[PDB]
Amino acid sequence: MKVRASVKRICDKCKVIRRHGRVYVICENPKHKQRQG
Amino acid sequence: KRNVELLATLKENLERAQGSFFLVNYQGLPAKETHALRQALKQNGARLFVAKNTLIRLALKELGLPELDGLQGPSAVVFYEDPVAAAKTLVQFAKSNPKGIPQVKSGLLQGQILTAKDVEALAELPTMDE
Amino acid sequence: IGRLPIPVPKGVSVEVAPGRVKVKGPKGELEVPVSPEMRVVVEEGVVRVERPSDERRHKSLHGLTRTLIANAVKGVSEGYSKELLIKGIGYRARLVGRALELTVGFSHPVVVEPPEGITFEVPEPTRVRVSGIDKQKVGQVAANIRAIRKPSAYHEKGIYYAGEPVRLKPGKAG
Amino acid sequence: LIATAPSVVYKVRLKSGEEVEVHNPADLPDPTRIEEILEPYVKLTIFTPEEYVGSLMQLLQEKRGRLVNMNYLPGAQKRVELVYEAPFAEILYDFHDRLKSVSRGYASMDYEQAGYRPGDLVKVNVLVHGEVVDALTFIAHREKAYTMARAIVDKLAEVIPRQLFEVPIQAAIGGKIIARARKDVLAKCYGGDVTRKKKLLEKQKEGKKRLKAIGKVEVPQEAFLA
Amino acid sequence: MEYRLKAYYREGEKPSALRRAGKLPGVMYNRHLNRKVYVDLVEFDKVFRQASIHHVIVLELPDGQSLPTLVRQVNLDKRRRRPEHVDFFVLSDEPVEMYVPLRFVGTPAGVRAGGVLQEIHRDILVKVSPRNIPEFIEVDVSGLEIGDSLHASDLKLPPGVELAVSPEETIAAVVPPEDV
Amino acid sequence: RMKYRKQQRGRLKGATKGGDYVAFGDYGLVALEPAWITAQQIEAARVAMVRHFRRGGKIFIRIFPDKPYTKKPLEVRMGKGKGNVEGYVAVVKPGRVMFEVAGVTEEQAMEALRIAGHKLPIKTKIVRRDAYDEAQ
Amino acid sequence: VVAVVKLQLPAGKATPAPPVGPALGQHGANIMEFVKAFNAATANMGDAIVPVEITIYADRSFTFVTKTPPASYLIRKAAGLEKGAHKPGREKVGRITWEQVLEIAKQKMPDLNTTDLEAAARMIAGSARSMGVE
RNA sequence: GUGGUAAAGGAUGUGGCGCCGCGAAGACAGCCAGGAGGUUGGCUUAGAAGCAGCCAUCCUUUAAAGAGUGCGUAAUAGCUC
């Protein structure tokens, strides 16, 4: 689920991501595709 | 910020209300069960601060806190700073010791102690339990 | 204090070299990447890096410095290794000696010949692993040999190392 | 034929004393204040392996389940003996398939039914421009009103549309509606007149008000019943 | 407690250059012994923050003067927040203007019952009092519920009492929820 | 809606810069250099508001509805002298003070303010108690 | 004998089936009919939360005796109180006479590891963030 | 590959800037054993006696004091913190 936007730490505690220039967040749960990219 | 003040003054006093020192480093068994040690002091005397486990540097050299003439025991592990003077050290100390052997993986390890003032030898401590 | 404190035993043959320091070990002779602006004092053989400065690039370089080199001596202290273990009711394995085994595609010329410092260990009908000079590509080819059919968000069948507590949610139920 | 899955009839006891009066889903429209449907039930008496109750006790509440009297046989192993009263028809839908899945199709069941006096159920109906529609509505018990609303109600669209009126056939279950389920001449005077467009736009617009009204029937029932 | 460092320049140019510096426009007034001394940000801004301030009187420190002073008119930006230009008055002889502070601690007559909240009234009183002035002027009230609210019949002021605003105009207010 | 009993039938236009001020009640918001905002949206605020403050935490709303707009009739062509009506807005330019006191306390507003912040067609800003004012 | 397992609950109740039933059940319980020997306790003592707790074994032994509580419910025995039926906390008298909980307790300090110093004057107040003698 | 015609809002982008958590009787971690000792619900009691739908507003220890963040159903476990 590459959402276009928002993203605000929804597997509760969650890691900001920086890779390929692209910037995301992954935590413990796959049901948390916060790729606003 | 959090320096030589409250939270680190009255803790000296049970060691200083008289001076019959006692100590322990045990905390290797669950607190839910470790209270058997914590409650042992009433059987060992009366609600004594045996096995308080006071903080290192905040009590690992508590003589530094308030001139206890050097409590040279073992900095290893936590320091109970057990207040035997607060209770009634005698043969009563054995109640706080024998319970610590049979229970847990040593529910109460032997440590440095000092009745009245001057420290007893650590090797002689087990003999002093009676 | 903690950014560069490495004891470095074995009688290690580590010494700074133009981008690539020397190694010896079980069979060791390895070279490691560097960017020279760092350099490390290695008198006797110490690891005790000198930072070129202290801006964030270098200081993140400070770890790439340390760490890569850090295991690099540890790795040749032995035939460096990661524990590993597939399990699941339907599969098999066999060290062969000179073929990879495995059975989970289930029509299965599975084997790819092992690369270099790689060497397999057949411990238990299910607990195979790997060892060798490397850590990283040992972290890879293993993951690669792991890479074939990994998961099973349900019944266990998963190829694993020691394995994280495998996440478990019901199929149709339970 | 068509397997309408369930077809429970139940027993109605209209006030003023009218006995069963031949309960049904189309036996005498609602003339007087219902007596709360009322019917029987079936207790829970079927062994089970391991701890599968977790899934049963949960889904079992399919109809205000009532722990008749939980039990646990001894000497056995995991096998339990749960008990809970319920209805008849209800235990005919989304039950069998579950009875197995819930416990992995382990153990069976057997009861004799039970329960009477009260028991919600109401009579969820539907709406379709016309009225009375085909012949649905039964007894929406436990929010069962909208439960199937977005399901049966949204009957696709009767497969057939008939005309371009777009009648809105809602679900007059008993409200207060619930469920929520033309030539192209306009563009021909091209390139201009957001005026004359409107002129010919009203012409047909008037028909709708004179169509749905005069155009009696407009009932395309006997489709699929789903 | 605060100081300032003076600037001869006034009106137009210079402060903006110092507004850029964050060095700030300022006022010394003395019952027509006026002067324009010029402030600077942050700290005296921290001084602004002191709550009792713009009320409880303050004392600037030009090289020598030890004069306590009061706030009143203050310029205020709208190209953002953060004020344009604060102004001042040291006491002279007969203090008069006295917009006296309030942080009311009335009894929660309503929240445990009707759930109405104690919606604020004046924030702070305007009451004359020469040099005998408390931090927290106070008015307890037990009739506080619903929407209609009691008026300031009874200020009960400290030593330097006066109804200097106007003879009583409401004490406070409470907001009704659903005409409960 | 929120307007009535008009003096006229259609204002003219302008927009350049203006001035509001201090908060009333130590919770509030403010913005930038707004274009006009429709009343629904204006009312939508409080509408958006009501659910969230303990689904009941009472709050004063804010600025009053203003100017007329219309596409005359619809999308024919100019020919109208300029008339007809539907929607109303606010004078909105220095970043007007938004009104948000309640006692409903803390973040519950503050993110509802973000709700509000995410709401409304202008970047804004967040405010509370600061530095008084005074009037005769 | 040493097959005991975790299983805490209340009692004084005549009907084990709704509560005590899936505990050791297939888990390892045997027999039923504890109610007759609940009478060995539930005729009087045990209204203070006083669990047996039984033990594991081939059979079900019996229901006999009951071990004494830690409890926030023991030291305040002399009523079972009365507040809390309609929405825990809030109004409904937070208070009825200061000794009432201490006078009825005092002897509160039964089972625990070794020994706490006093059930009454020097410990009661803490079970009221555990409840409301506060 | 920013120059390279775009908003909204995301963004531990990064830069330096002032404001506030250094507690060298030494921290926030990252670690490791504890992770509460009378800390157990009157309203569900289908169990909650934190860890579904129902109060947290006083003591015992001080190792700290989780009124208890957590995964959930026979309470509960059992892993966090």
From Swiss-Prot, chain A:
PROSITE patterns: RIBOSOMAL_L36. Its cofactor is Zn(2+). One of its GO terms (biological process) is translation. The keyword Ribosomal protein applies. One of its GO terms (molecular function) is structural constituent of ribosome. The keyword Kinase does not apply. It comes from the Bacteria. Keywords: Metal-binding, Ribonucleoprotein, Ribosomal protein, Zinc. Binds 1 zinc ion per subunit. GO terms for cellular component: cytoplasm; ribonucleoprotein complex; ribosome. InterPro entries: Ribosomal_bL36 (IPR000473), Ribosomal_bL36_sp (IPR035977). SUPFAM superfamilies: Ribosomal protein L36. Belongs to the bacterial ribosomal protein bL36 family. Part of the 50S ribosomal subunit. NCBIfam families: rpmJ_bact. This is Large ribosomal subunit protein bL36.
From Swiss-Prot, chain C:
GO terms for molecular function: rRNA binding; structural constituent of ribosome. Disulfide bonds: none annotated. It comes from the Bacteria. GO terms for cellular component: cytosolic large ribosomal subunit. GO terms for biological process: cytoplasmic translation. Pfam families: Ribosomal_L6. Keywords: Ribonucleoprotein, Ribosomal protein, RNA-binding, rRNA-binding. Part of the 50S ribosomal subunit. This protein binds to the 23S rRNA, and is important in its secondary structure. It is located near the subunit interface in the base of the L7/L12 stalk, and near the tRNA binding site of the peptidyltransferase center. PANTHER family: 60S/50S RIBOSOMAL PROTEIN L6/L9, LARGE RIBOSOMAL SUBUNIT PROTEIN UL6M. Belongs to the universal ribosomal protein uL6 family. This is Large ribosomal subunit protein uL6. The gene is rplF.
Swiss-Prot record, chain E:
Pfam families: Ribosomal_L25p, Ribosomal_TL5_C. Keywords: Ribonucleoprotein, Ribosomal protein, RNA-binding, rRNA-binding. The keyword Transmembrane helix does not apply. GO terms for biological process: translation. GO terms for molecular function: 5S rRNA binding; structural constituent of ribosome. It comes from the Bacteria. Coiled coil: none annotated. CDD domains: Ribosomal_L25_TL5_CTC. GO terms for cellular component: cytosolic large ribosomal subunit. The keyword RNA-binding applies. Part of the 50S ribosomal subunit. Contacts the 5S rRNA; has been isolated in a complex with 5S rRNA and uL5, 5S rRNA and DNA binding protein II; 5S rRNA and uL18; 5S rRNA, uL5 and DNA binding protein II. This is one of 3 proteins that mediate the attachment of the 5S rRNA onto the large ribosomal subunit. NCBIfam families: bL25_bact_ctc (TIGR00731). Belongs to the bacterial ribosomal protein bL25 family. CTC subfamily. This is Large ribosomal subunit protein bL25. The gene is rplY.
Swiss-Prot record, chain G:
Forms part of the ribosomal stalk which helps the ribosome interact with GTP-bound translation factors. The stalk extends beyond the surface of the 70S ribosome and is preferentially stabilized in 70S versus 50S crystals. In the 70S ribosome is in a position where it could interact transiently with the A site tRNA during translation. This is Large ribosomal subunit protein uL11. Keywords: Methylation, Ribonucleoprotein, Ribosomal protein, RNA-binding, rRNA-binding. Methylation of the protein is not required for function. Part of the ribosomal stalk of the 50S ribosomal subunit. Interacts with L10 and the large rRNA to form the base of the stalk. L10 forms an elongated spine to which 3 L12 dimers bind in a sequential fashion forming a heptameric L10(L12)2(L12)2(L12)2 complex. Contacts one of the L7 dimers. Interacts with RF2 (release factor 2). The modification N6,N6,N6-trimethyllysine is found at K36, K67. GO terms for cellular component: cytosolic large ribosomal subunit. Belongs to the universal ribosomal protein uL11 family. It holds the Pfam family Ribosomal_L11_N. Gene3D superfamilies: Ribosomal protein L11, C-terminal domain, Ribosomal protein L11/L12, N-terminal domain. One of its GO terms (molecular function) is structural constituent of ribosome. One of its GO terms (biological process) is translation. It comes from Thermus thermophilus (strain ATCC 27634 / DSM 579 / HB8).
